[model samples]
Target chain A: SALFEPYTLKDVTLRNRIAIPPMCQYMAEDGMINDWHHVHLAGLARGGAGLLVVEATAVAPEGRITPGCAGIWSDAHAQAFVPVVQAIKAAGSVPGIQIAHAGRKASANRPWEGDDHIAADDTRGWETIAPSAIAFGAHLPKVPREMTLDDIARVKQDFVDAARRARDAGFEWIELHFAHGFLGQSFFSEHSNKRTDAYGGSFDNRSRFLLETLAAVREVWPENLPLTARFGVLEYDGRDEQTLEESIELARRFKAGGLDLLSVSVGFTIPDTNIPWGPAFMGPIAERVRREAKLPVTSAWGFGTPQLAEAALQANQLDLVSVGRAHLADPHWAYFAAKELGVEKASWTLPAPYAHWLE
Target chain B: SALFEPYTLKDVTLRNRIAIPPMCQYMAEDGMINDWHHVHLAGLARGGAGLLVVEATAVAPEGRITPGCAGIWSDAHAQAFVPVVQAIKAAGSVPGIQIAHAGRKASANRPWEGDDHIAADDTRGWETIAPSAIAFGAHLPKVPREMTLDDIARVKQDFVDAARRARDAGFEWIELHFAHGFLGQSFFSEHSNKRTDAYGGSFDNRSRFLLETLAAVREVWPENLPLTARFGVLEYDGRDEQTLEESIELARRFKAGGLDLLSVSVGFTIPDTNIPWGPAFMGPIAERVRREAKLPVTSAWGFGTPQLAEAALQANQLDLVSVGRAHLADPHWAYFAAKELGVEKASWTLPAPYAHWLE
Candidate 1:
């Protein structure tokens, strides 16, 4: 029943420990979400998750992972999320968003539509910016334009603006997308960030973009609310121990710069790496980050099983279980988990209309 | 899978055999649906059912099963369904509504709230009208006022108006909620209708109210669309064979009167009945009705299992499978059934946003 227990951080209180992590729908149009996002998010919120995080939204148009990706770069785009945020809150779930810049991974087709970079001649393709002029290879073959000092500062300002817009749009939780081989993750990874300047080379320099962005966002983001970031703690690319150590050290820096929680994840910094994917595989890694960094932590990737999520929580491995794909399978996975966990009146995990008939 | 195959009745073609039957949510206020119905119905439509039938909506205020039940007695109430119907069609599912009058079952608490008749002194309670002054006698203990001939005429007129409104609201399919021991069922069953009048006593008299109402509604309802009625074929209270024979005879008459399909169900007409409940328990009965009455039939109760649904379809036991409570458990149940039944691109039973990730 630990998963069904309430969780509180700063000014927000979650009715349960279940958290729906950001998973891109790739259904937006021109960075504006329509009924697709509204209905999808509202339905998930009503499914009884304590927190429902929106997908990795772009901080700038060119920074989008695909043309279908949502954005918060403009006031109108931010305003588009107001109703969605209100619906989530109305359903008793905290609304969260992960503001992102895709870096070298930008301008790719949707996952189902070939999932590769758009051709140079393709009108949909845009110039991608990163810490260095590198390509992720494989599906992502187009080399990105290396960022100048001015570009780095501009990107940092974009993150701050995105955070401010998210706050104004009534998002209670803000997560800086610092993982998944995206812009922030690329800056922190040696494989992607080959910059000879202050933004790369050594651990301190490589961590500068993420830490500085967090500090800048913290200036505008509410101090009374939970300011979080999802960071890649290990790449699983032969140099994991060193990468994990550096990542944990950076986690400590993030906490010091007013981050309330850390969402630990694997660095998809490169595609060729052998990441051992399994059920609850990130438990120990997330636990280590939580212990070493002395910060609240959550992680996803195969924690959809009710028993596994309970096991992770009972073992003190995660502060909240971020369930993703299972929710896509069943938006009411929270109610299913409640039943699987033998919670009293498990059907009541849903709203009265559903609960009454289900009971 | 046979269950994934399209079905056509009249001019309406269902993309799949899966149908979401009318299951009351008891969330509407004063006969008007609000955000609860809008979000709930919209979400279910997106879950990929071929036909999504809205819950039983009363044709008049006094006909509501509970104070919270939705109604279509007025122009405004019917207009409230326009956006919901549009949402369903937008999701590629046929939108349907069941026009009902609760009769003796009127003014009961919601299933989870208490599932009993509201107290006579309670302001929420209303005077229920039925064939005779008989009570269902268990959870529903109130004796209803006997309907006069004028009252019968007025009730029939209400159904006509409701059907007209449903057509104007853009609903493609309509089901007369004559099952579940509501008004029509009470009038049809000998257990409740003990009147000596032309509208009550014998089989002909017992079926008169239902037959007349259907005929009246058919005048306003488009002939191009499927005309359906959910009827209880047998009460299973020791008079099974005779009741079923009579029911099938009435069904034959319904077919003669231009009925397109029949939703076969049990007669919840009285309290003291040993009705056998199990997985797909209604299959044989539904198949019998389909064969004897020579009409397309759909049935619910324990058809949530994918194999069971497929088996029934392959056996020609049903034209459509109505899965109710399972939908309350998971709105994307059609996708689950598709995956379980090994349909190609099973996840595509859901929308592209979910299908891509799930696949």
Candidate 2:
């Protein structure tokens, strides 16, 4: 059972290769989580995932994708996670957090609550900032306020403060949310970033914001722990080949700049693209990044099935399988996967209270 | 699906018939449940179960089955359940608790640890008390001290105090644990009770202790809320017909004495009984009790399969189907059951944070 095998990165060792990736819960109130998150994460940690990454937490209040998005912009916000972290650790799962800036995606309604940009007059909406004054179009029709040099520096500092807060809150792993057409992803994709400045246009210039933020975060995030980042390598907008090559180049630069792993994903840089969504769809792309970038990689988007996770691991396609929706359907999906894969005493994948009765 | 139908017992209404029964975790420290129970119970409440009963919490210190069993013998012990009750209510699940007295089965090791009585020399062990000095035989071989008339009064008072505390702690419902070969069941079954006093011997005498305890608890427990009791109606031993007849009569007596519902179960009164264990095996027996006693009944023992639960409900065999170990396997099993039963928008059975992504 390759999926059940332990995975080690630097000083951290996962009990299994099952990683619950960052999935926004959209249940917070004004960026501060309550009992919802405490029970949610703590429960998932007990569900047998080796790594339980917190959702895409906003580094700044304005960087939040919605009012429901969790944040670590202040000491009180970061302090909210301490009990959650301790619970995860108590369950013997590594707790990780992804500090993010939504950029153009910011100030949108919750996924189930329209999942589009809020009306300008709505008090819940805020000014969204991006690399360029571009509208994502369709659901996200608001043209974001283009970021100035000072804004870029401030956002980078926000990431640093977020990382520092996460560390102080006792998280052992950290991930830079550089995917999902958010701030970092938008900065690196030419479709969203057409600025003719040091931070946009050319591949190196487009990669500058992501790279600099990564380096800035590295200063505060402990080197002994896994420093990971989820990045969108392909847009699937008829420029995948060219975009992937540049993304891989940036992946290598991230590795050289102290990234322990890369979470390979599709670029949601623009809408109206034929992204081939299917089970284990990101396997080949993640494998390519793992090979070309020479870094451990994990990917999501349909590796929820046990055999698929095993196949990806066995084929060297993914170092870890990021299971998202399946976990939402069943937080104990890792134990289910273990049982499906016929791991010895698979029921033991869960905690004693559960495993005892299950066995 | 019939399983998804709302059920009203007295003033309390369940959104669905899926009930999480009292399954002991043995994770508490000196009768006080900590984060383990908090997260475990809170998470299950969010899993779409209509009624979530906290595990068998002892009414007195000596009534605890194991050192790790939860207790509500004191105000401080009962206070531990305050947050848990709030969390369960917050998740839209009716919170219930099974206040129990293990009697002869008290002071045993955790099931996973040994599932047997503790040694006399062990400081963790305490002298068990029951209606008569009898050993349950097999794994539970301790001969409990026969309770005096004064002890019986004190134990009944403990139940009243515990129920009062539970109400203060904000539990919406309560189940007196009179089943599973514990104190009440042992007192009812002649096989375990050899007492010649008013507490044992004939059917009326054997039922006296349980009836007295229930009547006492009724005084303190709110009349509007459902006052339930889990009672074993049959022992698979040779005297099934006679025992079941007497049990059904007692159910009628309970209904007349203000019992709102009866959780039907087999009498694990003795280890020597050849009890049949099958999926929904208790359905017919429960249906019989529901018909004869004219009381709403719920039953467990292998109703984990969604179809089985639906079948039992469709057949008018149960008011609620208690799914136990399946919940430990996957906390959101009610949602799984909803999906399996093909309820429209089945995934919405879970909370929006989970239901949105899953749908």
Candidate 3:
């Protein structure tokens, strides 16, 4: 079945369509990966995933969600993550890392303790920057200093540097954290951003940061490897209020900028909406975006059910289904889905350590 | 010295300047507190803190950061937290609960992951609500449905219900999670909130939600027990930006609504920037807000140093110093601070558990 078949994009090839979505471990100390991250990520790789992505690794120190978030802003970060990527690859899963600049979302208490802006004296908290001097909301009390032209240049360079490091760390796949109201999404959404500069305003201007960032990263990223961009398909207003057109335009630009695949989801600019809960709630967004962009697309959210996963694949709505928390709940989702769909060799998806135990 | 003096706010009295800031121990299952929360919070209480606040406990099922965060919205939740609070009070620290409606940040993954949005199919994630139909940002993908007037009424009732539960659970103090970009902050911040409704625009309009919430909470909270509001003083600009004047005004409104103290800090909308380390940074804002409101003030950030804690207390910049992550790093920080200040009774301040260890 196509579900269990190997897939290729650019220089990367996966044994199957299953991808462990990027999930931050938040265990770093001063941006350096620690043993906790190594074990945490390695366990996922050994769980028989086709591709395992390290959580969003910050492109710069100030780009972190908290001081503890992993980073590749420096060579030391690359050095630390290399072993983890190598081990995942050695375990037969394609190694990937989601490089990001949390932008205004950087520097706050860990999510467990309210995930609010960290006060300056917290040792770990520092100044955050954004496209404009706007804040996400009142609870995140710190208004980010608007990024100066110099900050933009530095940020672009940071992405380039991070991509180079990811390459050095032996990752064949580099997923740019372009979605989720991080730095990239900040530029994309009209709600959180209100700048008049070259980086704000019209669609072209607003997309300048992401386009430049992707271009810079693609320069350093190997041509043979796949460069993926995870994009928020809409700003959640439904109907072109903050439409797919802008995102499709962004996707077209990403493809022009040399991106290999588009992983699509929606919303985050306003954090308090009740999105519908069902298997295909988010699948349609990815499907639509895929059609618009004509690129290999991966849809997440609720494509976890076997029927939906197979349907999305068989219908050609998506090239991949990025399973996150679902995989955390059951790492063998791909194997089970394949088996449920009647693939004979689905058991091959099980990790060696667990194969005998399962039998 | 004033630093070591007993202080009364309403009917609750603290033995000294030290306080264990609310720390979320995300160890609940279906809103019920488990054993992990007991030891996690008990350690702080046993370390001899004057006050220990439980994490942002959800006032309802959907108000949690994750399904694992503790809840006090129901009798079951109250019954579960009673033993947890009893243990803390038994150890000599006043038990407190920071009841909250997480607003947009609610219904997401744990911090260890990128702390981004979680889809509803992921077992625990649910539909979130907010003052406006905005997502928290890109990380939280769900566009929170705007709180209908009915939702606002229900949410307020939920807070009141939680307060009653807190009283039943034996908490002597309760702080509303009004600050730090939660539901309350959602209404206060102009950046993330763009609604033209009564909850948006104008200071009076913006404060309507929180003021009403506080008044409702006060109705259930015993007059003898101190009810405090944690406010994010806008030190920076961005989504959740609120000026010092606005925050002071908020404090005044909260005080008018029966808030006994104001825990002052800055920047909730922005991720992390412009935080001056140490407790004194919070003093200026606390002083300004406290001066206008004439309420007791608690400084939660940068007050880890003994000298700063004493200075702020003596200068009347703050009435209480919240020793948060610092105390988490070292539970006996109060005793250490006292010793550092050359207080002869410093050793006596140590909780018996650590006093024996110190001896």
lDDT of 2 by residue, B1-359 (tens): 99999999889999999999999999988899999998999999999999999999999999999999999999999999999999999999999999999999999999988999998899999999998888998999999999999999999999999999999999999999999999999999999999998988899999999999999999999999999999999999999999999999999999999999999998798999888888888899999999999999999989999999999999999999999999999999999998898999998899898888787
Kindly indicate the candidate among 2 and 3 with the higher TM-score: 2
Count of backbone collisions in candidate 3: 48
What's the TM-score of chain A alone for every prediction? 0.99, 0.99, 0.94
**Deviating ranges (above 4 Å) for candidate 3:** A238-242, A272-274, A356-359, B1-359
In angstroms, how far off is B46's CA in candidate 2?
1.1
How many Å off is the CA of B178 in candidate 3? 63
> Model 3 chain B — which ten-residue stretch has the worst lDDT?
B350-359
- List model 1 lDDT by residue over A34-98, tens digit each: 88888899999999999999999999998899999999999999999999999899989999999
The TM-scores, one per candidate, come to 0.96, 0.99, 0.50
Error of 1 at B125 (Å): 2.5
Q: Which ten residues in a row have the lowest lDDT in candidate 1 chain B?
A: B34-43
Q: Write the per-residue lDDT of candidate 3 for residues B130-202, one digit (tens) a residue.
A: 8787766667768888888888888889999899889887999999887777788878877667778888888
For residues B1-359, write the lDDT of model 1, one tens digit per residue: 88999998889999999999998888899999987788888899999999999999999999999999999999999999998898899999999999999999898998877989998898888889998899999899999999999999999999999999999999999999999899999999999999898987888999999999999999999999999999999998999999999999999999999999999999899988999999999999999999998999999999899999999999999999999999999999999999898899999999888988888
Interface RMSD of each: 1.3, 0.8, 19.1
Query: How big an interface RMSD has model 3?
Result: 19.1
TM-score of 2: 0.99
